[PDB]
Design an enzyme around this catalytic site. Structure first.
Site, PDB file in Angstrom:
ATOM      1  CB  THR B   1     -15.510   8.372 -18.528  1.00 37.75           C
ATOM      2  OG1 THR B   1     -15.260   9.437 -19.301  1.00 37.75           O
ATOM      3  CG2 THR B   1     -15.755   7.236 -19.148  1.00 37.75           C
ATOM      4  CD  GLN B   2     -22.197   8.141 -15.998  1.00 34.52           C
ATOM      5  OE1 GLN B   2     -22.093   9.155 -15.595  1.00 34.52           O
ATOM      6  NE2 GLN B   2     -23.089   7.229 -15.990  1.00 34.52           N
ATOM      7  CG  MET B 107     -14.751  14.507 -21.126  1.00 34.66           C
ATOM      8  SD  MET B 107     -15.067  13.789 -22.785  1.00 34.66           S
ATOM      9  CE  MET B 107     -13.980  12.243 -22.540  1.00 34.66           C
ATOM     10  CG  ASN B 108     -20.246  12.987 -15.110  1.00 36.21           C
ATOM     11  OD1 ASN B 108     -20.526  13.582 -14.177  1.00 36.21           O
ATOM     12  ND2 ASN B 108     -20.598  11.662 -15.204  1.00 36.21           N
TER      13      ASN B 108
END
Lengths: 122, 233
Positions: B1-2, B107-108
């Site tokens: 996540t970012q 999730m990235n």
């Protein structure tokens, strides 16, 4: 005694690695291929023996490209040739990925060199 | 996540009778700071495809590299790399769609919204969208971010359904897109006046236009507006 030529990384009493020498025989038994360096480039050419009229002409290409600026041709066991080029391609992509610039031929050569040398260590 | 840092706004596009058009301004924003102005967000792949990207610019640069590698790889042991076995717009999209969904599933994500525009080998027009969530869809017109809200309504007045495609010319289509780019410059606070536009025609091929500018803007009526209600001067 004898038997120094049965295992790959063994030094014979005269300091030779017979298995590598036997590999060379496989090469000398292969088709002829060459390369000529010119004033601003290089040319590669190779002999493709026509085993029979059944081989579709122009189809079984032998010369291979690595990245977009390198040409490779080889004599001997073809499958070993492809194997080496696959490595070369990974080696080239990895170089470009980190340094951005496509891999210099000298640098590319040592990459292939170190990999092949590695197969004479075990 | 970012979280996205340097970003590109809208990417608008549509298809006409002989191909597809896609455009995107040349800005790379940093929050409310309009930091970079020489940013090209339209990525040509071969001569039948153009990939327009909005969202995180560092991820766009990453996708760019992925695209160049696709081309390099496809050429390997491929005597038909520039013919029957050249990269089709649909292959490029399926690839990106696959990567986008895999990345969101780990999730990235690659914080982007992408539109792949091009012409298939059989001449068919290709226009499909994919974003950071792996979501995909097609429509005669496609736009990301702000353009979805302001460009689609305008471009749809030209091509409101499939049957309107064969009735739309490159002139009409390019005109719509250029008008839409101007509208976006009026109401989108993260837009730029400078943009790039690309046309992919099954006959004329790929035409990439750089350094275009929004022109013919109406601002004069501004002199007549004073105060915010009762003020007279």
């Amino acid at each position: 005694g004898t038997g120094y030529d049965l295992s790959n990384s063994v030094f014979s009493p005269d300091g030779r690695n017979f298995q590598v020498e036997y590999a060379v025989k496989a090469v000398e038994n292969g088709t002829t291929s060459i390369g000529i360096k010119c004033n601003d480039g290089v040319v590669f050419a190779v002999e493709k023996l026509i085993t029979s009229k059944l081989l579709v002409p122009q189809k079984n290409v032998k010369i291979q490209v690595v990245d977009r600026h390198i040409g490779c041709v080889y004599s001997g066991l073809i499958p070993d040739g492809r194997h080496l080029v696959n490595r070369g391609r990974e080696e080239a992509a990895s170089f470009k990925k980190l340094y951005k610039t496509p891999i210099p031929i000298p640098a590319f050569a040592d990459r292939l060199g170190q990999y092949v040398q590695a197969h004479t260590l075990y | 996540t970012q979280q996205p840092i340097v970003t590109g706004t809208s990417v608008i596009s549509m298809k006409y009778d002989n191909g597809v058009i896609i455009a995107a301004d040349n800005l790379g924003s940093y929050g409310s700071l309009l930091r970079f102005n020489g940013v090209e967000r339209l990525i040509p792949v071969g001569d039948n495809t153009v990939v327009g990207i909005s969202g995180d610019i560092s991820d766009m640069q990453h996708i760019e590299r992925l695209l160049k590698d696709l081309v390099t790889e496809n050429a390997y042991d491929n005597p038909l790399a520039d013919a029957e076995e050249a990269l089709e717009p649909s292959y490029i999209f399926e690839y990106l769609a696959t990567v986008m969904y895999q990345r969101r599933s780990k999730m990235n994500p690659l914080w982007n919204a992408i539109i792949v525009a091009g012409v298939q080998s059989n001449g068919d027009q290709f226009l499909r969208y994919v974003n950071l969530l792996g979501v995909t869809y097609s429509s005669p017109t496609l736009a990301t971010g702000f353009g979805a809200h302001m460009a689609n309504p305008l471009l749809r007045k030209v091509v409101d359904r499939e049957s309107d495609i064969p009735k739309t010319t490159v002139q009409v289509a390019e005109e719509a897109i250029v008008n839409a780019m101007r509208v976006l410059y009026y109401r989108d606070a993260r837009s730029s006046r400078n943009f790039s536009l690309a046309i992919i025609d099954k006959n004329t091929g790929l035409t990439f236009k750089k350094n275009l500018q929004v022109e013919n803007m109406k601002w004069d009526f501004a002199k007549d507006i004073k105060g915010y209600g009762t003020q007279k001067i």
